[PDB]
Amino acid sequence: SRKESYSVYVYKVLKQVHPDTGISSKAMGIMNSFVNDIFERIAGEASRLAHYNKRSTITSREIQTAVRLLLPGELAKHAVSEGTKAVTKYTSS
Amino acid sequence: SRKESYSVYVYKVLKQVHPDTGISSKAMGIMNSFVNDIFERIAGEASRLAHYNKRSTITSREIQTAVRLLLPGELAKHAVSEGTKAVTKYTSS
Amino acid sequence: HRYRPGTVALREIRRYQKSTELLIRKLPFQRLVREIAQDFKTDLRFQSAAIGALQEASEAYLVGLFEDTNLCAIHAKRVTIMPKDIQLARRIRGERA
Amino acid sequence: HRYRPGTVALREIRRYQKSTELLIRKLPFQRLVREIAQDFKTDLRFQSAAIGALQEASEAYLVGLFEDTNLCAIHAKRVTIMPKDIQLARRIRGERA
Amino acid sequence: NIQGITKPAIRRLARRGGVKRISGLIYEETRGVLKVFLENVIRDAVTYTEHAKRKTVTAMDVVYALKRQGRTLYGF
Amino acid sequence: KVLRDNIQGITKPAIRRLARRGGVKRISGLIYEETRGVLKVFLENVIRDAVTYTEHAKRKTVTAMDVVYALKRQGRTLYGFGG
Amino acid sequence: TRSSRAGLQFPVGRVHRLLRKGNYAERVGAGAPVYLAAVLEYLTAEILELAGNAARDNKKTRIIPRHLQLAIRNDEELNKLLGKVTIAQGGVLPNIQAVLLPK
Amino acid sequence: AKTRSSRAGLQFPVGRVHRLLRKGNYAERVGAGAPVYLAAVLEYLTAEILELAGNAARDNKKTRIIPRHLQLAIRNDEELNKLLGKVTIAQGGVLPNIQAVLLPK
DNA sequence: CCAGGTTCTCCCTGTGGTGAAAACCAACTAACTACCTTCCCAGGAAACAGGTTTCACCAGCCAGGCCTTGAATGCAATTGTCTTACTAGGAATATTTGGACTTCCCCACCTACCATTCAGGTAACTTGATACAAACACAGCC
DNA sequence: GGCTGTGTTTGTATCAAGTTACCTGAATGGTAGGTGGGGAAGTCCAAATATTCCTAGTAAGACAATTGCATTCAAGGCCTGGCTGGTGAAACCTGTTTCCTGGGAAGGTAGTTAGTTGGTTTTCACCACAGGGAGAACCTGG
Ligand SMILES: [Mn+2]
């Protein structure tokens, strides 16, 4: 059939961060499963946060609280900063 | 407001199994949280089982497989027997 | 007269396993909870049952920790717990890395 | 000429921590998995990659178990390990069979 | 403050676990670990209470934070 | 074909090399048999789950994703096989 | 009435609503919630059975959480199901290690 | 800017993530900037891991990245090990680590 | 074996938590309808078990031997145990004050729909990072 | 100081990326629309703060007795290596079984209305257990 993945985006991020570092197929499969794992965790936690307050809509606030819950301190701080910058950049356009 | 619970059904089951055993309020609250906990576990596992096979309907089969997964051996065997009896009793009526 | 050392300790062990009341005094625990809570966010109020829930969780956690610590201490042919036993138990559970 | 006890073990520790191939021969593990699979249901077929995934997971489980057993044995002022250490580590993990 | 956890009180907890004889240096140890155990719970629970834009921690926030830890609490 | 006497397929140098990777120096002679027993218990609490997924979709072949879902349920996530 | 028609005790309509209002799938087929209600009925019956036995063995007739704690922590299979569970006002089993007791 | 990632200046497909969030039954409905924020989170985490991965890769004079380097970069750090302490990487291996009392004199 | 000290049991008094009962009211079932995922049937083919060979690497076995473990021991020292002063928590109670919660009302905003399009999986052609072999320097080990 | 292993470059060849042209289908875009969510005021509930007092738990000081700990020695139980044969492993051909795709029929299940019956709430008597105090007796040091 036609299976969906993330490898091209991993290439783009890798070439933004490193010019001359290759990558095997096994590492690509590991990073693909890694992205699916974190996305599954955050989506499930956001769903329970939306369900707890009798709300019926996922917004950016629930994902911000979920990322503040799951990730440890420094990663949570940097991730909230990055996401806030991205939301402002999208909104001003 | 008006909160929902299970205490009357716990009374009915208790009087089916014991004539002269009382129960405090604290034990009732514990059993209420217990029922909500097991129902939450089974419903979540049935949802993931329905999602894994690209199916979009929860039936009795998924709950049978979920109860066979979560509970240990003897409890799983007796629970599958009880649920099968209940399904046949409902269907024949 | 006097008791031999250790006998009334076993008496106390039977006494506290027999009963199920709270053991840590309430107001020092409540001041400790509010004192820790000041650092993460100021101007916070607590429902009292939430403080009770924290007390229950802390008690159960410490009881399980002391049981596993006792097992580690009995393994090394001693009958007295030591801080390396607590560190060993918290390592094997994987709490601290 | 003969090596002393102590050095060969360190050489093997450094080698088998350096390299990351597999350490269990494929066919006896395959016979074992297919045996235990037959014990539940008759006439079951496996993709080979699922057998490889099982071998990877069970190797990881045994390596982590021996690391925690080594910590428990070093705690009791010994160097040799004994099955008391494995039994204690599996009790403290909580998985009690 | 942290010395509110009292020296004969801790003994009682160890007597519930079935410990016969205790050293002294456990005491300065035991105030540490308990403190760390609060520093993971309350940090989560406050994060719920700011999410609902309220100023009072209710019991269900503590129950949810303990459920995410795995130490599931009944009765509440 | 009946199948039996395969738990001794795991040999003493294999467990020896596994303990060498963990950082263990001296091994008693009584570890070996005991280790086998632990391994057997572990495989039960994978395979008993795994085939249930295979029993659910009405199949005869246990794929790799079923083992990955079984290990993900047991609390040991595995990467590198999809899912 | 569905609970009488199956000959059960837990409210089938309530469990059916809670499967609807919980967002678990698209559609919930019938035959599922009666099966689930039977499972919950069996579990509650088992626990109240053992709790009543433990309560009668202490010369009482009401149930306090000490009874529930001693009922769960004696049976093996419920102990393995509820290992991650803390019960309020519970306590532990009377448990003494071997080398503690004197001579 | 045609794509939404171009409108936000990111690299992960926001339409794909929005499709998954709608068809993963996580809610009744999805707000606007939620997949944007989530794509940002994933991009930051992926860059943070691949950077230290490439550093550990060039520390052994190799050009490509094999999973041994991912294992060593995850375990040698602290925050990732707190995050990923329940994960077995295929072809992983352990850290080079020997206890203190085992070394002879 | 004897003195005393804590623990189990029996009986009397009191109570407030609990089972019971009348009234209130939102949820539960029956009946009809569209429609829609799902059950059933058949085939192509990818893959899995089966077998065989030939080799090639490693597991078993047995003797030597030597270092780890373990029991016995003396000695120091830390901790249980008892007593005396003291001090701060438990509880009622009043004050108060900020705050959650609920009733209404108004405004952004996500969904559905449909026409348009480009960037992304797929395959063939091309180069190159590296395992491997092999010889030589250094480090170190006994 | 002689025996050994790990590391330092040289060179291949090769299989494993990397690059580029192409065919699909998932993303983008303007417009109703209704609906979920933000604001505003009361009110009533519910945490915070003073007070006192008195009692039961806590802090401290001495004192032995019991446990932790360093030492010492015997023995045994496990490291080491040489060699035989023994089974894993790689490759290749063969049957055949199960899976996936595809089309058609269908029974099951959302969706709306109407009728009603079980699920909550308040108050009311009263009994199971708290409290205690007294006797008895099992328990532990002398
Ligand atoms: Mn068999």
Author numbering:
A (entry chain H), B (entry chain D): 29 to 121
C (entry chain E), D (entry chain A): 39 to 135
E (entry chain F): 25 to 100
F (entry chain B): 20 to 102
G (entry chain C): 16 to 118
H (entry chain G): 14 to 118
Anything the authors wrote about it?
Firstly, the NCP containing D02 DNA is less stable than NCPs wrapped with strongly positioning sequences such as Widom 60115,29. However, exposure to mild crosslinking conditions (0.05% glutaraldehyde, 5 min, 4 °C) yielded tractable particles that were visible on open-hole cryo grids. To facilitate asymmetric particle alignment, we introduced a biotin moiety on the end of the DNA arm distal from the integration site and decorated NCPs with streptavidin. Next, we used single-particle reconstruction to determine the 4.2-Å resolution structure of NCP-D02-streptavidin complex. Firstly, nucleosomal DNA arms appear to be flexible (as detected by inspection of the local resolution map reported in Supplementary Fig. 3, and given the significant number of unwrapped NCPs averaged during analysis).
Integration of the reverse-transcribed retroviral genome into a host-cell chromosome is catalysed by integrase (IN), an essential viral enzyme (reviewed in1). Herein, we employ a combination of cryo-EM and single-molecule Förster resonance energy transfer (FRET) assay to understand what impact retroviral integration has on the structure of the target NCP.
